Amino acid sequence: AKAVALLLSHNADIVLNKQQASFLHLALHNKRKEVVLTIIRSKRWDECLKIFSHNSPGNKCPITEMIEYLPECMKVLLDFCMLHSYYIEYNFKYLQCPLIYEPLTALNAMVQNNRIELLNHPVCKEYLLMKWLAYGFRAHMMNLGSYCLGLIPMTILVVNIKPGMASYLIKTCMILVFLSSIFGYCKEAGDISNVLEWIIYTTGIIFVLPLFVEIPAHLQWQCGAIAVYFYWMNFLLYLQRFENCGIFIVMLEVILKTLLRSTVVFIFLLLAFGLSFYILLNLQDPFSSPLLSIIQTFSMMLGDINYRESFLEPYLRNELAHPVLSFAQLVSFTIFVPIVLMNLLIGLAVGDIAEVQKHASLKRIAMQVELHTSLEKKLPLWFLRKVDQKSTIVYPNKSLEMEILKQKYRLKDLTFLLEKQHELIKLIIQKMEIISET
Amino acid sequence: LLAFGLSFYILLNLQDPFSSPLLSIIQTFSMMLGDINYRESFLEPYLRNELAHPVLSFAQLVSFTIFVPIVLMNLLIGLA
Amino acid sequence: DISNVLEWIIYTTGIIFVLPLFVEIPAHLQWQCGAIAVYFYWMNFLLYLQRFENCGIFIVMLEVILKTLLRSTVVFIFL
Amino acid sequence: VGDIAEVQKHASLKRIAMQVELHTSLEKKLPLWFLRKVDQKSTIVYPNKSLEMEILKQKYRLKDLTFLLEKQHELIKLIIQKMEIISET
């Protein structure tokens, strides 16, 4: 640090090295700390960042390398970017993008290196809030409004006309639903959520189809039911998307995998216990047919049936023929199978939810910046060039990996020094005046 | 409640516990609350072939009694 | 492992069910065997369908499942 | 939940182990004709169709450092044992 600082205090030109590696690039590549501290501290940083590197992507922008390699240095730099007085001022101008470069290039760099201490840094948080309240909130509100433009008339019309058939209020509702569905189709044209909205939009298309050609009533009403139910589910999805954190969509994949496993395990256990109960309790009327048995055992797992009269009372009158077997099936199905299945399912859910509670906890900012860059890239330049802001004011009234890493570098320096010293001492013996004790 | 309410309304209009959308939302409120007779209300009409949407109604039933509450309790217990 | 004794259960019971091909067997025993055989048949087939997947975590936790069931089938009776 | 967490770690690292186990058992209990016929060597895939070893490294580096320092100390002892201490004798 002393060498670089002393050189910079004097005239010491900064130039390309024909490898597209500036002196700052070399300082950062070698993971050096005090030199980068003395270059942030000292002046001429505007000039040092000015030279940049734009030809060979082998050495990227200085800010991106700064993010990737030394996090604490950018922590100090952003601390210097924060201003106090409590007139808190955010200087910006160090997160800036120079117009393969993405709009939020520094943010993408910091979220693809999981440097959480910099994502939760106050300046980046305010930057995200500024971008949100500038354009992201407006765009998301526009999307939700275009969706509600189809949601509201669907509910109104389903409440209006009694199902079971194939005054201008109906026509207005139908035309609103058609235009909203077509607009959403266009939006999607321009993950599980994707197939979900494809389901909803296809079903809305089926519901609006009798505007063109005749469709049977029963199919129309089946489509209407599935469409309304999925409409409200999707709107709950969007209302969750209102919140910045998207943990719910993250765990929705776990939800759907658990549902896929359950919708087959439950059917198979229904079938198994169905024939078991059929051959076991044939003497009674609720098991006369195998179909009756599977439906009634479906009721048994569903949660409502009278155990006393159906099972236990016939035992006392000795009208039942398999006491041990029937009681074994009863205990195994009511307090052995559901308890174990709930234990297994809760264990799987808790493990995956803990995994999410860590990964999505460090990736909330990542998904936020992801949707922000996607929105900016798919949006024209007029809006961004008009709303873009640089200054903000906030009023009060309105842990071991890097330490072991540091130890490793210090020990490497120590062993280099000791090797040099040993070579030096060998130099000492190789020319000595050994005469008195020769 | 609202979603499953209209779903049950348009799905089970043939019966009396879904005559009005208000009746449907209140009775489905009862369904999530925890006390209602499933046998007579749903399964028995299937055998006499008085119901018109077997697959859809059974899908709604399974999704609301052993697919939605299980997943919601799992999610809530995980967060807690 | 538990799967071995499980399939031994199923195969023995299937043998009892096919026994009246050779010699006469009382009907009640035959139907008891049929019930246990069918129920274990479907349970074993669910086991195999899980074995379809590469990961065998379910069979791994099945030992925990059976130990919990062994504790419960006595604690519940005693209570 | 305790046992399921234990499984979610052990079986997570042992899924591949049980897979290879059943594969070797199947291969050993199968004749050689099928394997000698189906055995393949090449495959193509198309896109469209953390602290134990660091402390261990530190331990080896420190062992090397202390060996070097022991040798250097012996060397310096060699330096004293033959010296021309006359001016300050």
Residue numbers in the entry:
A (entry chain A): 561 to 645, 654 to 667, 679 to 745, 767 to 790, 802 to 1009, 1039 to 1078
B (entry chain B): 881 to 960
C (entry chain C): 802 to 880
D (entry chain C): 961 to 1009, 1039 to 1078
Excerpt from the paper describing this PDB structure:
TRPA1 (Transient Receptor Potential Ankyrin 1), a cation channel predominantly expressed in sensory neurons, plays a critical role in detecting noxious stimuli and mediating pain signal transmission. TRPA1 is a non-selective cation channel localized on the plasma membrane, which exhibits permeability to various cations, including sodium (Na+) and calcium (Ca2+) ions. TRPA1 is homotetramer; each subunit is composed of six transmembrane α-helices (S1–S6), two pore helices (P1, P2) between the helices S5 and S6, and the large intracellular N-terminal and C-terminal. Four identical subunits interact with each other to form the central ion permeation pore, below which the coiled coil (CC) is located.
Crotalphine (CRP), a 14-amino acid peptide, has been demonstrated to specifically activate TRPA1 and elicit potent analgesic effects. The 3D structure of the human TRPA1 with crotalphine binding was determined at a resolution of 3.8 Å. Notably, during atomic model building of the TRPA1-crotalphine complex, we observed significant unassigned electron density in the C621 binding pocket, consistent with potential crotalphine binding at this site. However, the limited resolution of the electron density map in this region prevented unambiguous modeling and refinement of the crotalphine ligand. Structural alignment revealed that the coiled-coil domain and the cytoplasmic ankyrin repeat domain remain stationary, while the transmembrane region of the complex undergoes rotation and displacement relative to the stationary domains. Simultaneously, elongation and straightening of the S4–S5 linker and the S5 α-helix result in an upward shift and rotation of S5. Concomitantly, the S6 helix undergoes rotational movement coupled with upward displacement, resulting in concerted rotational and translational motions of the pore helices (P1 and P2). Specifically, the pore diameter of the lower gate expands from 5.4 Å to 6.7 Å, while the upper gate widens from 8.1 Å to 9.3 Å. In the crotalphine-bound structure, the S1–S6 helices do not undergo the complete rotational transition seen with iodoacetamide binding, and the S4–S5 linker fails to adopt the fully extended conformation observed in the iodoacetamide-bound state. Based on these observations, we propose that the captured complex conformation likely represents a transitional intermediate along the gating pathway.
